[PDB]
């Protein structure tokens, strides 16, 4: 995607917030933006923490959430005004109430405008609300898994990606990443114990999408094969896109 160096961009740390909800999204020399989020069903609550790293107040501090056109239809975000004056060394919080209307690919933009020393300060960063946040894990027995796997009918509902590892292929980190992504992590389904299997339901207002995945590490080749099978083509695509970036 988007060409050129991802440093000083709107998305430097986005990928660190797909399989976890808490941490520092952005930090320049004036402002730190932290996150803490929780999701249930098709809903979420995201706390955004604005930290003034300086010894002077920020004035007219105004964070705004922007959702590009298709995103508008698929994601509803509700929030309340933040106090515009932020003391040096202080933090102010914003709470963002999230409702997923239907599956979606784009991310909202958080724009922050404030005055510091009489100067106009402007920051834009992509906010890590991603489709996998709306997962319900679904534990099930291996027989039930394979019966559902083999109900795929529409070829477009199956998406596979064979890709080079970007990170060390550590077993326990991999387990943690799948659990953080949000599906159940099913053991004793793939007879090869080195592979990972997941199952869950993506919840949206209008549609519930059942999802099955398989991750096959190839340690000597430093490669993975990821397979998504779900009840909606666009969900298989976005989940494969997201998960692939994590390994």
């Amino acid at each position: 995607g988007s060409p050129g160096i991802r440093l000083g961009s709107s998305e430097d740390n986005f990928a660190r917030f797909v399989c976890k909800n808490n941490g520092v999204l952005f930090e320049n020399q004036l402002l730190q933006i932290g996150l803490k989020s929780e999701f249930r069903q098709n809903l979420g609550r995201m706390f955004i923490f604005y930290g003034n790293k300086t010894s002077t107040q920020f004035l007219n501090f105004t964070p705004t959430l922007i959702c590009a056109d298709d995103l508008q239809t698929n994601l509803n975000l509700q929030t309340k005004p933040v106090d515009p004056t932020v003391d040096g060394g202080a933090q102010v919080q914003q709470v963002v109430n999230i409702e997923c209307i239907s599956d979606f690919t784009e991310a909202p933009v958080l724009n922050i405008q404030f005055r510091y020393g009489g100067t106009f300060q402007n920051v834009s960063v992509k906010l890590p609300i991603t489709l996998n946040k709306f997962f319900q894990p679904t534990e099930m027995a291996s027989q039930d898994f394979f019966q559902r796997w083999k109900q795929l009918s529409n070829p477009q509902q199956e998406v596979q990606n064979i890709f080079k590892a970007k990170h060390p292929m550590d077993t326990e980190i991999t387990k943690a990443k799948i659990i953080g992504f949000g599906s159940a992590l099913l053991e004793e389904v793939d007879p090869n114990p080195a592979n990972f299997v997941g199952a869950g339901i993506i919840h949206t207002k209008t549609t519930q999408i059942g999802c099955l995945l398989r991750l096959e590490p190839n340690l000597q080749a430093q490669m993975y094969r990821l397979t998504l099978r779900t009840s909606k083509d666009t969900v298989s695509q976005r989940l494969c896109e997201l998960l692939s970036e994590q390994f």
Binding site: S142, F146, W149, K150, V189, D190, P191, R214
Partner: peptide, 5 residues
């Protein structure tokens, strides 16, 4: 053999 076909 392979339950995934």
């Amino acid at each position: 053999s392979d339950p995934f076909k």
